[PDB]
A paper describes a structure:
Here, we showed three complex structures of 6mA demethylase [name] [name]-1A, a canonical isoform of [name] ([name]). [name], one of the AlkB family members in [name], demethylates the DNA damage modification such as 6mA and 3mC. [name] [name]-1A protein has 291 residues involving an N-terminal extension (NTE), a nucleotide-recognition lid (NRL), a DSBH domain, and the CTD. Like other AlkB family proteins, [name]-1A requires the binding of the cosubstrate α-KG and ferrous iron for catalysis.
Numbering used by the authors: 33 to 122, 140 to 262
Amino acid sequence: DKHVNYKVFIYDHIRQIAIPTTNLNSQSSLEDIIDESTSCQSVSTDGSIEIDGLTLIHNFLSESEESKILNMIDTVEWAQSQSGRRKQDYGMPEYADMLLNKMSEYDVKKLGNYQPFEMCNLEYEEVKKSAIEMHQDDMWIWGNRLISINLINGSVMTLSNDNKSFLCYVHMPHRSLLCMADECRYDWKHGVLAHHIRGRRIALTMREAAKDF
């Protein structure tokens, strides 16, 4: 753990702020996150922070929508990625248009006007011990908003801030959408630890370019 002596926060999806907690650590179990995530509303705002650009929307997809998408996903072949992951590189998929619209309908200001260069499905699997390390995309090549939709199972998106030694867990439930922009995009690195994966999960990624080139 690089985050062993970090200050750990939990994201309150209702108040849309990160509360510090002593009940979590850098090696917290997936259950610990969920219990703290649902119990942090009554906790004090003392020491809390606001992470501008972090947008979690519960139940972004319905079960019909998800089922339709998952069936279309599995027709296409899976490539090999790193750290026990697989991928499908796309823009091309028919279900992209739908997702872009729903994103605009919920919020035209933030999630509208979105033309991503890449749309990528990232398959996780508990048995492979799939994961993605803490990292950040360069602002000179990659743009503002990073979308991620939780298919099959939810998980936890771990955020870090090295300059301030802040660790933050965002519980992403089944069929939730996480948009990462602004501060969250540019001042925080993001990752998903192996012990936060429940069975199989497919993260439906999107990302826009910084420039047309």
